[PDB]
Symmetry: D2
Subunit: 253 residues, 4 copies
């Protein structure tokens, strides 16, 4: 099963406006830099982080322990104007996992309590022998159908419509959905089958007239899972699979 | 008149898979760093940049001339595994400006044409006497209603539902809408008035049960307009004004 | 006339140790990231920053005004766990200029005074019509004589021996010397001539058995001057010039 | 036994000037960003990296295996306009470890050969039971004596004289010396004793009238060693040790 870490900037709202408001262009840089660092440092141990709302983030951390989490927390404290709290939870589905993690976080106190800083806890347990399933979803021919033909903002609008439709659809399976740039989305989705995605894609195509494909990788860590998902997408592209979904499992054991 | 610059990574799609696919954690760090650098560099000249789709970005660039754009483009080439193209356009409304800018980019060639490297052009003209209006929009008490109450993913889904509702609504006015983190959004909106915002807001409250406020800053550059809009949010919070919208202008 | 800005991290020593000492990998990353941002941001206005001691940094800022300095200071304030002080001076020579700017800074108070935050002042005046001369200095064939032949640490020693020799020689002409990487050095050096450089290079060769070359650029900004120095170095390499120094000056027409 | 990794930007020289020379402010940002990333990424595994010459860096990597090295190399390739080669070696002294790693790197080819990309090798062995010793050297009262008294460049000058003097001294013991900012230096110094530094420190004071102190830390990784060296410096400052050197072990 899947281990997930929820990450929150401590008491961030008061900081951003106290003693005055702060240049937005600096806060964008500050926020992206945090995100970039978190992916390098969790990435160093085969994790993956999605940006979510920026002041709150979700990470798949199968195989990353409590001491490693503490050292990443300590690195942020030494180089940033703020601290971060982190709670870990495991569960059979991604949605179960983050819900438990968030519950324990909230038990410690408000996201705006100056006394509440650098929480670091495990809600139930760390995953000893589990797995992550990631589906890497992509639009067929975004460049010829949107990027090169309609405005920058209309492509962005259209991609945000598909994104929300996919979020509502996937939530029925306790699966999560995150934008990763371009026309690309990743869905932590332990428990879903290929036939589940083919259903969702039929509905998205009927509503929005957009064609979707996905590689599904299953592995021991987020890194392994997403690498296998990338190969699936190439297989589909090189027409060495019939359909718009492809599953690959890790077996280099 | 607002000036918009559209920014595109040249031939980005083929690079991410040639010779092979690349670890996604690396691609996230790369994309985020490019976004951060663009805000520092355009910010150094009082511009502002929205992440948009990460391989395509929209910036407000009133007051930033062609040679500065070129300098910024050179800096990315010297430091990244790829290049970027940029086209500038002016117009009365934000929507029109980026439309004009995209159209000229498209005349030069495809987003995935390896011989279309480093376009740098002006679709019509650079703004010499213009202004920027930015509305900075925020949800009331996100902490007490959602962040401290429901799961992380549930607050994320709800904020994204509000985001798309606001994108649809604002487009009738030829305004744009971008997420900037937590419960905040920014809307380049030359043409709109306080009453246009108050109208959109109670429709959103009726539908989603969330209450919004907004500071409207009007200035000569993205930075001035965004700075003023931030002050309007503080006036609403401090009860120095009695409605959920507040306009401040550079020469008040 | 050359314009120099001295930049100093306010009350830095106490911060690195309060409440405890901080992990050194984190301070190296923080310090390097600050120096990079100052080059991007001053660079965006055609300036150039040298890392100097990291908590104290020296920059050439001809053509960059007081408001722009303030905006850069503010950006650091919004994204880092400390603030920075800056003082600007202009003078006929680099050594004079930074000496004046340092003295004004010192009048405001101590490097470890917690109530001395975000100094920003000019010591005399901002250069109105002035110029920058930069010499870009480099060792002939580092790769064949040292990099590919001797240990990593042995090239590092020899490169540092030459660095100190140049520092001391150049000081007699009121010029500065900073290491920019590899086997490369930059010398702001308003007042010096090609012959002065050939005289220094002669002594260094005789003493260390290493051969030096330099392009000298003269321009209105640090970017103009240092781009021109770069071209000079390529001309020496391409034997378009018959000596180990080459001067190029800015001509917009 | 100390384990050292030498890191080199492949064929960097031709890249900086082809097809044209590149703006210097950009190259400074690029090189500093690379240095910073390398410390976060090796740091995430309890290593430490010193900038050295920027195109050539030296790292202490006790406990960091070959697979972790390969993945860091891959991260750089995915995000920079260039690639890096890395060779690892162990030995009793820092100086000999870096020497053996370099010779092996040189066996693969020139630092300016385009076909020699992303070398990754071990010269002898990865250290299983080793230790690192790091002395963290600092100048007593730089602020009152130099920073607040003389010009920016004058203090920079004196700190660089002390730096070269220490490099040459420490090399007699096969120890390395790196500037880390301010008035601070680190010396991987496996072998040396407190009295060894006390002799070096006497000579530097007699020649330059600069008074030095050092916390010395002995641990199983670079991170452990330098954290203990930091505690050492604080004991000296807190006057709860007698002299100007101070050792803590893990
Ligand atoms: N995060 C992320 N973005 C990607 C990845 N691969 C491609 N992209 C993005 O996808 C965009 C469009 O590229 P493609 O998907 O290859 O183009 P396409 O036009 O849709 O062609 P096909 O998808 O092959 O039908 C690029 O500009 C990138 O932004 C990836 O692995 N990760
Ligand atoms: N991008 C950006 N985000 C901000 C800014 N100010 C606040 N935020 C975000 O807003 C989040 C929530 O803080 P607040 O809006 O102050 O919290 P609230 O509970 O909604 O309080 P009120 O809006 O005053 O009722 C923070 O965690 C930040 O992520 C800003 O200026 N720019
Ligand atoms: N900071 C900086 N470093 C440079 C620049 N150009 C080259 N270098 C560095 O110089 C190092 C050695 O490259 P070269 O100078 O071409 O090598 P060389 O072997 O000395 O060859 P020649 O000088 O042509 O004889 C590279 O690895 C870079 O680190 C530059 O413009 N700025
Ligand atoms: N890299 C690095 N630099 C440090 C560290 N601690 C302090 N510094 C630097 O040292 C500079 C001067 O501060 P101190 O060394 O505490 O000041 P001092 O005036 O010499 O005081 P004493 O050392 O107590 O005699 C700071 O500005 C920092 O650059 C550290 O742990 N690592
Ligand atoms: Ca696609
Ligand atoms: Ca709010
Ligand atoms: Ca050379
Ligand atoms: Ca000291
Ligand atoms: K703001
Ligand atoms: K990928
Ligand atoms: K330290
Ligand atoms: K250069
Ligand atoms: Na794609
Ligand atoms: Na907010
Ligand atoms: Na060189
Ligand atoms: Na110090």
């Amino acid at each position: 099963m899947i281990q997930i870490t929820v990450i929150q900037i401590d008491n961030y709202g008061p900081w951003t406006v106290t003693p005055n408001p702060r240049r937005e262009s600096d806060l964008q840089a500050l926020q992206s830099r945090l995100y970039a660092d978190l992916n390098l440092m969790f990435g160093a141990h085969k994790g993956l982080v999605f940006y979510t709302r920026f002041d709150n983030l979700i990470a798949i951390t199968n195989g990353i322990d409590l001491i490693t989490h503490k050292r990443i927390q300590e690195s942020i404290r030494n180089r940033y104007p703020f601290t971060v709290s982190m709670v870990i939870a495991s569960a059979e589905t991604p949605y179960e996992a983050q819900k438990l993690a968030t519950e324990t976080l909230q038990e410690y106190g408000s996201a705006q309590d100056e006394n509440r800083k650098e929480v670091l806890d495990v809600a139930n347990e760390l995953v000893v022998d589990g797995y992550v399933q990631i589906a890497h979803i992509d639009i067929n021919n975004i460049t010829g159908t949107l990027t090169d033909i309609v405005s920058a903002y209309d492509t962005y609008l259209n991609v945000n419509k598909v994104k929300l439709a996919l979020m509502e659809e996937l939530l029925k399976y306790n699966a999560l959905l995150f934008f990763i740039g371009g026309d690309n989305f990743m869905a932590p989705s332990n428990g879903m089958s290929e036939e589940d995605f083919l259903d969702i894609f039929n509905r998205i195509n009927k509503k929005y007239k957009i064609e979707l494909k996905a590689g599904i990788g299953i592995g021991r860590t987020a890194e392994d899972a997403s690498n296998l998902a990338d190969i699936g997408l190439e297989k589909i592209r090189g027409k060495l699979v019939d359909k718009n979904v492809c599953t690959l499992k890790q077996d280099d054991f």
